[PDB]
Design a protein around this ligand. Structure first.
Ligand code: HEM
Ligand code: HEM
Lengths: 362, 363
């Protein structure tokens, strides 16, 4: 139930241990006034310092003037911080406003079309995002609700996604979680303790060509539907061949333990792990941080199920793009469909109590 | 603790301790064959015994014949029982099948239309329900996903709702939870410790008129959306006046502590507590066991959030119906809308290892 520090060289919510719950929101900007937008970023930063420490925003949830609406909506009263992190990102579309066109980073690349894509335009894109992660869903909803309220008249919610359980790991010392296909997901990631790998593959550097982004990262979000009727009638051998790992232990084919290193040539040529591995992609490595979702039934007698896939990287052109291109022949494609997509530049950390989200850009 | 016993005179998940998470599903029946349906109830009961003890269904999630589909879909491997309870109920529409029309309980009453209802037919009704409650949401979802799979060809999923209450790892057991309006919710309820009040207000008795239902109960489910952004623009005073309790402590007006008994005359005439209180309703008293929901945002950017209201009672005609009728003028109506509804008869418990869900009805 402890707090995660809000200040640092980088934003929290990336290398941080993965929390149980997600509430992700994408917002579009409705004001043309640069000064008013800056004022919003500062007020949001102040609220975030309170929320991540388990305190109410502004003057509190009660005990003010009877005739005024309370500053905080009150539904997190008496709850612990619950490892709340709040991570902000800026979409490519933001850079068409406030005279920012020449500051759009080259590494914030638009994604190509991929075979099999069926993207819903209303649950794609966005001028900006807030990723709220916490171990308590009520704490995460409270944060998003209060930020949206503060932003009334300057930003609107475009789309949101809740994640009921994690399907990722930045802590290899702890149990790896399972996705809704029943396999462990997160074994070969980047750990929060691997400082050299984070510097090489995740954090943007000064030399990369965009000074304001130094210490930030780039985020790809993909909403992926799972064809669970089709999957659940597949044989055990079929399921294991798709991935290249066994279902029970999650060991590479032929080996005994989860964390034994894969031997790729024993896997089928279209196995997911074989196609996604760094050695198959010229060394390209990602930090995966996604969550499972279910949004009701599909209207055809079945549960809906999916995975909200989140990846962080130093450059979209050298991280997600080459790996997803290599997945064109993946055996997994028979059982999934990408139905939503967004990219964001995630700025550097808030250094201290006088700093604010986006200060290096504005 | 870690597990809740499955066997009993009553089904678990009613009077047993309230768990942190819900997955509620309504099912429609696609078979006309009574024997095939009974076979399904037996298979489902066997699966439920496994699930509630933290074991995989059938022969397991791995290690069988490579060329067969696994019996269990595998996403709960490595998790704990998590206090899972599975509670089954039968809707009025089931009793038009299998020759059961003369065994529908009179206490399983159809609800009247109430003022301001805006019910979505696709998220209403259903022949059957399973209420899955657990501390870990993946344990609850895995239960529903595997029951639906076992039943494929005889039942389909009509509608499904996820919900949340407190997170017990971080929040004391004695603290009342808050709903998404920021008010404490559950102060004056029937507790699972109150054996006599359960016998009076919750469990069906033999003399009530339907022998197969003795030790069962009746469930009303209402999906209630909150107009969150309108509520959040109301003054503190307006919010407190709507309920008749203060927001910080949750005490009745003119009192000091949450658990102080209310003085109804100090509240406004259309305050929610005043209208809902048993003394306003001829002594009618309910067991509330609902969960908050947040599904996402709608097409206008508004939060799709609310309360998935669940009430158990000895008779729908003397429990939910009188109380909800008395809320016709509730000040809360400005901020909520009922958008889904269903009613179920929840049979008695599974007595021992040879018994099965629905045995008193089917024989
Ligand atoms: C519903 C979609 C997906 C499922 C169910 C899934 C499942 C898995 C599983 C079970 C593993 C093996 C355990 C592990 O090392 O984490 C894995 C590995 C991996 N996946 Fe996926 N995945 C999906 C989508 C994607 C996407 C879209 C990408 C990237 C474009 C991706 C990239 C990776 C990578 C890089 C690995 C690690 C390979 C290695 O270095 O050994 N996955 N995935
Ligand atoms: C979104 C919908 C609702 C909200 C936000 C809500 C909220 C509350 C709150 C804050 C209390 C006071 C604390 C407590 O004793 O639990 C309360 C009490 C109560 N509510 Fe509601 N409620 C809702 C809907 C309903 C409905 C549909 C019914 C019944 C048909 C109902 C019946 C009651 C009862 C019986 C009490 C206890 C009164 C007493 O004996 O003091 N509520 N509700």
């Amino acid at each position: 139930g402890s707090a995660v520090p809000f200040h640092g060289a980088h934003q929290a919510g990336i290398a941080t241990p993965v929390q149980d719950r997600l509430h992700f929101a994408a917002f579009d900007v409705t004001t043309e006034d640069r000064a008013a937008f800056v004022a919003l970023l500062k007020e949001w930063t102040a609220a975030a310092r309170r929320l991540t420490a388990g305190h109410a925003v502004g003057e509190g949830a009660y005990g003010g003037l009877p005739e005024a609406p309370p500053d905080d909506t009150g539904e997190a009263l008496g709850l612990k911080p619950s490892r709340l992190t709040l991570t902000i990102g800026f979409g490519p579309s933001l850079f068409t406003r406030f005279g920012l066109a020449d500051l759009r980073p080259e590494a914030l690349a638009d994604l190509p079309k991929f075979p099999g894509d069926n993207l819903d335009r209303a649950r794609s894109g966005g001028d900006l995002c807030v990723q709220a992660c916490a171990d308590d869903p009520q704490v995460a909803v409270h944060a998003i609700r209060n930020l949206a309220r503060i932003g009334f008249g300057k930003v609107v919610v475009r789309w949101s996604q809740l994640g009921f359980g994690k399907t990722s790991s930045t802590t290899p010392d702890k149990q790896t979680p399972r996705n809704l296909l029943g396999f462990k997901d997160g074994t070969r990631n980047i750990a929060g303790t691997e400082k050299d790998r984070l510097d090489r593959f995740v954090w943007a550097a000064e030399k990369d060509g965009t000074p304001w982004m130094t210490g930030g990262s780039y985020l790809v979000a993909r909403r992926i539907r799972m064809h669970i009727e089709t999957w659940d009638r597949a044989s055990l051998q079929e399921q294991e061949d798709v991935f290249g790992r066994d279902k029970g232990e999650g060991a590479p084919v032929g080996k005994a333990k989860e964390r034994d290193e894969p031997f790729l040539k024993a896997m089928k040529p279209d196995a997911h792990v074989r196609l996604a591995h760094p050695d198959s992609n010229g060394g390209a490595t990602l930090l995966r941080r996604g969550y499972s979702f279910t949004d009701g039934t599909d209207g055809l007698g079945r549960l809906d199920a999916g995975l909200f896939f989140l990846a962080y990287q130093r450059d979209i052109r050298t991280g997600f793009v080459p790996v997803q291109r290599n997945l064109a022949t993946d055996a997994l494609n028979e059982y999934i469909q990408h139905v939503g997509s967004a990219v964001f530049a995630v700025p550097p950390g808030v250094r201290d109590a006088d700093d604010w989200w986006g200060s290096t850009l504005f």
